[PDB]
Design a protein around this ligand. Structure first.
Ligand SMILES: [Mg+2]
Ligand SMILES: [Mg+2]
Ligand SMILES: [Mg+2]
Ligand SMILES: [Mg+2]
Ligand SMILES: [Mg+2]
Ligand SMILES: [Mg+2]
Ligand SMILES: [Mg+2]
Ligand SMILES: [Mg+2]
Ligand SMILES: [Mg+2]
Ligand SMILES: [Mg+2]
Ligand SMILES: [Mg+2]
Ligand SMILES: [Mg+2]
Ligand SMILES: [Mg+2]
Ligand SMILES: [Mg+2]
Ligand SMILES: [Mg+2]
Ligand SMILES: [Mg+2]
Ligand SMILES: [Mg+2]
Ligand SMILES: [Mg+2]
Ligand SMILES: [Mg+2]
Ligand SMILES: [Mg+2]
Ligand SMILES: [Mg+2]
Ligand SMILES: [Mg+2]
Ligand SMILES: [Mg+2]
Ligand SMILES: [Mg+2]
Ligand SMILES: [Mg+2]
Ligand SMILES: [Mg+2]
Ligand SMILES: [Mg+2]
Ligand SMILES: [Mg+2]
Lengths: 117, 305, 99, 116, 287, 62, 97
RNA sequence: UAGGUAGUAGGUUUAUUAAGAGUUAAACCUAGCCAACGAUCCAUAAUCGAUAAUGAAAGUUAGAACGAUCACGUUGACUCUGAAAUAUAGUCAAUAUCUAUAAGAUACAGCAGUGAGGAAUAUUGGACAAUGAUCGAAAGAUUGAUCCAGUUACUUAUUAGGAUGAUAUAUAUAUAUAUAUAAAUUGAUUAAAAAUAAAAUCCAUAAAUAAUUAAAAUAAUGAUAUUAAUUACCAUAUAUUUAUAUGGAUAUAUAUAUAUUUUAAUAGUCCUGACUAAUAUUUGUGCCAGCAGUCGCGGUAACACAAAGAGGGCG
């Protein structure tokens, strides 16, 4: 109870809210600019200095940040059906409806997230 | 140094001296009898000042310090009496100047030992009615009414609430004769609220005191540099006192479920942000502790929260 | 709402026989009244003095009949001839030794 | 139900007085264990109506505070709801008639609507 | 709760929340509470004794301690006398339903009020409550059944035999008076055992036409034409935090009682030093 | 352990079942224990009226 | 005494053995000090006081030390203002609580 | 426990791996690495929180309960499948019981329960109705997870009755009613009380007895369950929960005039020399018997032992 005052007197914990987009998007321009700007050197430097070598097996730089094209992601995860009009039977129709609903929701969620950030 | 002190009267009374072996009487009991005076065939202690109820708008509160414990008055004439060497009562030889000269404040002081506790005044029914009319028919704001009369806004609202209830009762014919008589007796007991008397009017600038104000601060400003209430509020990081007084004086997506003929209840879905909605995991079980939380239902049932 | 008795099971007794799980020996606690069986609920059955499991089963089969789903004795789950998953290894070995 | 990720009710509160915690969880993890994401609550005991209210003809309500957008997202990524949860969602108006099983399948009195 | 036992003894001059005759006498003959010639602890103990006897004698000590709030409340007038902060020690109990009912004078005592609400007579915002530990919010009405209020504030309804005996004496006195008037309607109680209508028929004085002294409406739970309680005056202290209407017996709880520059709204029969000592005690649980 | 035995009368042999608690007999040195008296072969102290639970004594029951 | 109820500043004073520490107090917060200090405050009109005695707690020396601290360790705001040549406002008073 | 370390510290390569690395295996070099800011070695211990305790707080304590993490499922090693296992699987060995006596089977740290150990910790319960889980296309099957009840003052909470109440007779539009005889418990003879305490009196309410009807769950399914709750002779029909009018229920006088189930109350335990709240006193013992957290008390006047009276806490 004593340590709950750090977290606004909240006894018990929730699980961490799980990011819908798990990397920065392409539309987040400022982040991209920050990433691509010249990395500093000297006292508060990041990488390796130009003259200095790096360990044989290891990479010199850090790996590049995979920026999500959101439209591309949507297309891949949630492809619209190519065979557009093939639909008979009740169970099949139900499945199709379910698929459509899932497409709608995940599309909306991603787009909203992109806008929201 | 504390003993067990039997609570005898501070005032003087006729103690026991000797008495017939069988009677087994106590000095406290004797003192109580004396205070009461003689009891009727009916049961009434008539000679006691405080037996009958005042019909004066002047509350008959207790003054044991002033009359020196001698409570007995003659019922018809309200003139004081004592217990003489004989068992019969009679008038006192010396008159009490303390009872004759008494203050305004102490007449509205129910307990002798606590000066701070005073009785609140009673509103006259006509005044209450006028207030009710003002709020409903004339359509005035409660603050204006409060300013006019000298009541507080919550008090005014309470009065209004009570008036409408009284009216409804009258319409239904629930206000019985015995109830009316009781109301009249209560009215007679208490002093009346005068809207003109400035000392009787309620102080309408009472804000409640916050935590930040109580903790004292001091500032060394230059000798000439001015520093008003606003500046003080700014230093403390509050809104000004006047603004708070003024304030005192003065969305979310909800769905409802479809209701089919057979089903017995709706489903109200309110929106809520994730990370703020649920019952938390590993919260403190407070049920076996004495700081356990006990709430109440819509039906007045006691429920563990 | 009362339903009609069908050709295959026109009687209460016939219905009981169909549903099974020892629903026979229950013709005395309620007599052969078609309306009676169907309108009756759980509390009434309990008062009469039937079992909990039997009560549950009958009501379910009544409901199925009302909805015109095929009622039949779907038997309760049975352990294997050898034994329950846990006890098999030993039991099977014992059985082998015997035979 | 099927799946690895599943939207279900985790039980909370005391004996003879349940409240439910709508979560998304792993199928393997326990019923009342800490989940992936709590989406909402659900008290099954309906709000008790007054005698006058009953006479008038006003139905009780079951309160279900719920993150709609999150739930939708979880449905989209393919987290199968439980039998009770899916019914609740259908009642709300997230899920369609498509999810309604044969047992569930009666004139409607009151229609759904969003309010504020 | 803590059982009622010797609440209104005289050898312990404990001033309880009641309108009892013995309680009144105790109040009368106490004077102050003497805190002279005592250690600090002894003073604190004597404060506890007196102050808790009035404020929540039914409450258990541990329970009280749990409910007891350190953070007292007050109001700045922003327009002089010194505010009595520490009279607020038992402000938290006025929030209770039972105490509020007592303050309203819908009960003779706090115990009685408690009993009333257990029996399901009080209401608060319509719904009837059977729970004394219920706490009013500001704006909440509460409403006792008017008969019970009348019983609380009315006289004790006499037994039939007692009433008949009282009547007999009154009749004799009347006869004596008429004899005295002449100079310058009998009843036999042994025969008339328990026939109330017969008694009514027999009796005819100027001040009661038929009804016996104590029974005009025997079915009602109080004295005859309703009159007040035998010592009602010295305890009729009209509170600030409640708005009352005695016709319907409704009452709006409008405020949590609070201390002003002049006064406190916690109605108590004890001076501020006593209340300070009590506060001191209950901060530390008598450490 | 050297255990004290309180009360007027003690029923204790050379083999009796006895329960020990952590008091201290202050005048006797090197004995830092009390036999708790209601339980075991140690019987409750007889004709005890005051402070009965401190010894074994049951309520006399009129 | 500040506002006719408590000391001005948080004083910390040594009288022989006894080390005194007396903090000022917000109004309503009572006397929360050693029994001797409390007794002296009751007589001297101090309503609000926090504090704690370190080292010796010799009753007599507490009584002597605390009155010395009151008379000597305290400086009134007005005196301080006069000495320094500055305004020394009390913010709470200005606010009107 | 003061020196420890020799795959040890680092370099170069090859295998193995999804993948880094003296992680293993192999090969060849350099002489390192850690340490008195505590190495190596030994002992003890599952770890933790927005959990529990305590404090003014910094902190300290617990790690039962709620939750998160680890490890183990009698002991040790290895193997297989697999994304992931030294798997509660299999293999072999170790310990100890079973028969069926066999390149057997079992291992309650799953739920009940038993014996033991111990100061000390529960039912060989009911139900899958709910919430989950596995199988199944479905029908619905299983579920000692779970939900319910049982035992246990271990903890918390709510109730566990209010108002009036110091005598008994007899006599005789007012009202201080007044006399007379009798009685009156333990103390005590006055500030020595016990005692408004009892008993009485007025008023309910619980429980009971009848009637009714939820909710947990609906498509249907209710273990809990003589369910919670409500009404008091039931229903409908007006108004604003109360009030009145109808319909029928009922029973005596002579269809319609007064009624309408019943009804209580019950607390221990510690203490009264000071610290420590407890002044009404008295008896027994006589440095004994005994008391005692601490200082102490008991040698005939014991406020301290053992009791009666009275009192003070908590309940
Ligand atoms: Mg499946
Ligand atoms: Mg003792
Ligand atoms: Mg005892
Ligand atoms: Mg190594
Ligand atoms: Mg090597
Ligand atoms: Mg390598
Ligand atoms: Mg070491
Ligand atoms: Mg261990
Ligand atoms: Mg720790
Ligand atoms: Mg744990
Ligand atoms: Mg630890
Ligand atoms: Mg455990
Ligand atoms: Mg293992
Ligand atoms: Mg192992
Ligand atoms: Mg077991
Ligand atoms: Mg084992
Ligand atoms: Mg044993
Ligand atoms: Mg235990
Ligand atoms: Mg199940
Ligand atoms: Mg089972
Ligand atoms: Mg308790
Ligand atoms: Mg005697
Ligand atoms: Mg009942
Ligand atoms: Mg003392
Ligand atoms: Mg003696
Ligand atoms: Mg002692
Ligand atoms: Mg003694
Ligand atoms: Mg005694």
């Amino acid at each position: 109870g004593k340590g709950a005052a750090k977290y606004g007197f909240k006894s018990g914990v929730f699980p961490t809210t799980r990011s819908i987009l798990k990397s920065p998007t392409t539309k987040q321009t400022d982040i991209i600019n920050k990433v691509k700007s010249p990395k500093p050197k000297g006292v508060l430097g990041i990488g390796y200095a130009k003259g200095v070598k790096h360990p044989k097996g290891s990479h010199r730089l850090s790996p590049k940040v995979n920026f999500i094209d959101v439209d591309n992601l949507i297309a891949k995860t949630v492809a619209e059906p190519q065979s557009i009009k093939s639909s008979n039977g009740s169970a099949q129709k139900v499945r199709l409806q379910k698929a459509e609903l899932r497409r709608k929701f995940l599309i909306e969620a991603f787009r909203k997230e992109e806008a929201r950030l | 140094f504390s003993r067990r002190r039997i609570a005898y009267p501070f005032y003087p009374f006729k103690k026991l001296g000797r008495q017939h072996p069988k009677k087994h009487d106590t000095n406290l009991k004797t003192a109580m009898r004396q205070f009461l005076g003689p009891k009727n065939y009916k049961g009434e202690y008539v000679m006691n000042k405080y037996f009958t109820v005042p019909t004066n708008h002047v509350p008959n509160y207790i003054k044991p310090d002033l009359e020196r414990g001698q409570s007995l008055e003659h019922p018809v004439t309200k003139k004081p009496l004592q217990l003489r060497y004989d068992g019969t009562l009679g008038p006192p030889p010396v008159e009490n100047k303390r009872l004759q000269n008494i203050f305004k404040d102490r007449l509205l002081q129910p307990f002798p030992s606590n000066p701070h506790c005073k009785t609140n005044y009673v509103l006259s029914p006509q005044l209450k009615q006028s207030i009710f009319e003002e709020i409903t028919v004339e359509g005035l704001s409660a603050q204006q009414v409060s300013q006019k009369y000298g009541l507080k806004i919550p008090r005014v609202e309470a009065i209004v609430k009570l008036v409408s209830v009284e009216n409804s009762w009258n319409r239904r014919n629930r206000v019985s004769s015995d109830l009316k008589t009781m109301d009249e007796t209560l009215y007679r007991m208490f002093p009346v609220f005068d809207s003109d008397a400035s000392f009787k009017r309620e102080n309408l600038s009472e804000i409640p005191v916050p935590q930040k104000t109580l903790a004292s601060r001091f500032l060394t400003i230059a000798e000439s540099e001015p520093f008003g209430p606003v500046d003080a509020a700014h230093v403390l990081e509050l809104e000004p006192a006047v603004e708070t007084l003024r304030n005192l004086s003065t969305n979310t997506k909800v769905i409802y479920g479809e209701l089919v003929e057979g089903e017995r209840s709706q489903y109200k879905f309110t929106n809520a942000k994730v990370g703020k909605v649920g019952y938390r995991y590993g919260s403190g079980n407070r049920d076996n502790k004495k700081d356990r939380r006990i709430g109440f239902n819509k039906l007045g049932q006691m429920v563990y929260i | 709402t009362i339903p009609k008795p069908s050709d295959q099971v026109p009687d209460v007794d016939a219905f009981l026989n169909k549903i099974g799980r020892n629903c026979n020996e229950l013709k005395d606690t309620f007599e052969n009244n078609w309306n009676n069986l169907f309108q009756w609920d759980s509390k009434i059955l309990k008062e009469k003095g039937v079992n909990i499991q039997q009560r549950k089963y009958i009501l379910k089969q009544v409901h199925n009949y009302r909805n015109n789903r095929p009622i039949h004795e779907i038997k309760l789950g049975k352990k294997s001839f050898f034994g329950g998953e846990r006890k098999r290894k030993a039991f099977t070995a014992k059985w082998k030794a015997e035979n | 139900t099927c799946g690895l990720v599943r939207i279900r009710l985790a039980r909370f509160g005391r004996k003879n007085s349940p409240v439910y915690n709508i979560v998304v969880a792993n199928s393997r993890k326990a019923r009342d264990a800490k989940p992936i994401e709590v989406l909402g609550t659900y008290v099954p005991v309906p709000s008790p109506v007054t005698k006058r209210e009953l006479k008038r003809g006003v139905v009780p309500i079951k309160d279900v505070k719920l993150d709609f957008d999150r739930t939708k997202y979880w449905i989209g990524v393919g987290a199968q709801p439980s039998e009770t949860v899916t019914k609740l969602l259908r009642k709300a108006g997230i899920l369609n008639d498509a999810w309604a099983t044969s047992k569930n399948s009666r004139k409607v009195v009151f229609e759904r609507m969003e309010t504020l | 709760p803590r059982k009622a036992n010797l609440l209104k003894s005289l050898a312990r001059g404990r001033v309880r929340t009641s309108f009892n005759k013995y309680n009144l006498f105790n109040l009368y003959k106490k004077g102050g509470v003497d805190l002279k010639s005592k250690s600090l602890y002894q003073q604190k103990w004597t404060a506890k004794q007196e102050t808790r006897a009035y404020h929540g004698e039914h409450l258990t000590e541990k329970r009280w301690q749990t409910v007891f709030k350190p953070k007292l409340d007050s109001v700045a007038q922003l327009d002089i006398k010194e505010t009595p902060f520490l009279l607020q020690t038992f402000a938290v109990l006025e929030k209770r339903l039972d105490f509020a009912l007592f303050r309203a004078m819908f009960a003779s005592s706090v115990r009685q009020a408690r009993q009333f609400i257990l029996h399901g007579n009080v209401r608060v915002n319509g719904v009837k409550i059977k729970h004394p530990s219920y706490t009013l919010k500001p704006g909440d009405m509460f409403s006792v059944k008017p008969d019970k209020v009348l019983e609380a504030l009315g006289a004790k309804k006499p037994s039939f035999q007692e009433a008949l005996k009282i009547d007999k004496t009154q009749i004799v006195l009347w006869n004596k008076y008429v004899k005295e008037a002449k100079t310058e309607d009998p009843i036999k109680l042994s025969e008339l055992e328990g026939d109330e209508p017969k008694a009514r028929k027999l009796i005819n004085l100027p001040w009661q036409k038929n009804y016996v002294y104590g029974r005009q409406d025997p079915k009602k739970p109080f004295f005859t034409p309703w009159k007040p309680r035998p010592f009602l005056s010295p305890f009729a202290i009209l509170p600030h935090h409640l708005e009352i209407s005695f016709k319907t017996c409704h009452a709006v709880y409008l405020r949590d009682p609070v201390a002003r520059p002049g006064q406190s709204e916690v109605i108590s029969p004890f001076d501020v030093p006593v209340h300070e000592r009590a506060y001191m005690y209950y901060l530390r649980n008598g450490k | 352990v050297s255990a004290y035995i309180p009360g007027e009368g003690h029923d204790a042999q050379e083999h009796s079942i006895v329960y020990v608690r952590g008091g201290r007999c202050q005048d006797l040195p090197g004995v830092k224990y009390h036999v708790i008296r209601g339980a075991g072969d140690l019987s409750g102290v007889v004709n005890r009226i005051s402070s009965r639970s401190k010894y074994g004594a049951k309520k006399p029951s009129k | 005494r500040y506002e006719n109820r408590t000391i001005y500043g948080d004083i910390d004073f040594r009288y022989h053995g006894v080390k005194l520490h007396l903090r000022s107090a917000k109004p309503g917060f009572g006397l929360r000090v050693n029994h001797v200090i409390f007794e002296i405050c009751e007589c001297a009109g101090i309503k609000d006081l926090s504090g704690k005695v370190y080292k010796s707690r010799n009753d007599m020396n507490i009584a002597k030390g605390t009155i010395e601290a009151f008379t000597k360790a305290q400086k009134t705001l007005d005196e301080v203002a006069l000495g320094r040549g500055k305004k020394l406002v009390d913010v709470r008073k200005v606010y009107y609580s």
